[PDB]
Design a protein around this nucleic acid. Structure first.
Lengths: 51, 63, 66, 64
DNA sequence: GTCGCGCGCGATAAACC
DNA sequence: ACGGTTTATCGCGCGCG
C-alpha cells in the first residue's frame, strides 16, 4: 500500500511519511523501473514524476 | 518493449488463464532463454506478469 | 562443506527463539558471504535448514511440518 | 593498495582498447569479485577507467 | 550519509535427449 | 579409442562500508 501513497529526495519522503528510508528507496526504484518516476542526479538523488 | 509484446501476446493468445515456461517461450519464439528470462522477470517487477515459484517457474498475465 | 557444519552448529546454538541473516553469518564466522549463502541454499535444499523469504532472507533450523 | 596497480596492469597487458568483465578479473587474478568491483568502480571515479554499459559491465582503460 | 541489494550462479552437479 | 548440451528460482546489473 506504500506505493499507492507516493522533486524531492527519499530522505525527505522518509521523514514526511514516517517510513524507513530503505523502504522508500525500494518503492522509488521500483516505480522508476515501472517508468512512472524519473531520478535526477544528486547526493542524495532527487525524485520527480514523469508525465 | 518489442520483445515484451511478443511475450505478452503469446501468453494472451495461449488461452485466457494458462501459463507457460521460459523454455517454452524460448522455443516458440526462437530466442535464447537468457533474453526471455530478462524480459519475464522485468515484466514481473513492472506488475505485467504473475510468477508461480517452481522448477521451472510458470508465467501468466498479471492484473 | 566443512563450513556447513559450522553454520548449523552456530544456528543450533540459541536456536529456540529467533533466526539470523547471511550477512550476520559472514561476520560471525569470518567467511565471505559468497560461501555462506551457497552453503545455506544447499543446506535448505537438503532439509537441514529452512529459508524464510525476506530482505534480507532469514535462516533457521528446519521445523518439521509433519 | 597494489590491487589498483595490477588491475590496470591486466587491462594494459590485454591490448589496445580491449575490455573485460569483473568476473574475468576475479578468476585470472585469483581475487574475490567483491574486492574487484569496489576497485573498478573506484578507478572509474578517479577517471582512470571507463565503463561500457552492459550486462555484465565491461571495463576498459580510459580514453579520456 | 550516494545504497535500491533480494545474489547463492559454477572452479557445475545434475539432468536431459 | 569420446555423451554434447542444457538446466538450476539461473533472472545477476551488485561495488554497499
Amino acid at each position: 500500500h506504500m506505493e499507492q501513497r507516493i522533486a524531492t529526495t527519499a530522505h525527505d519522503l522518509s521523514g514526511k511519511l514516517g517510513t524507513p528510508k530503505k523502504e522508500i528507496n525500494r518503492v522509488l526504484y521500483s516505480l522508476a523501473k515501472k517508468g512512472k518516476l524519473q531520478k535526477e542526479a544528486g547526493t542524495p538523488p532527487l525524485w520527480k514524476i514523469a508525465v
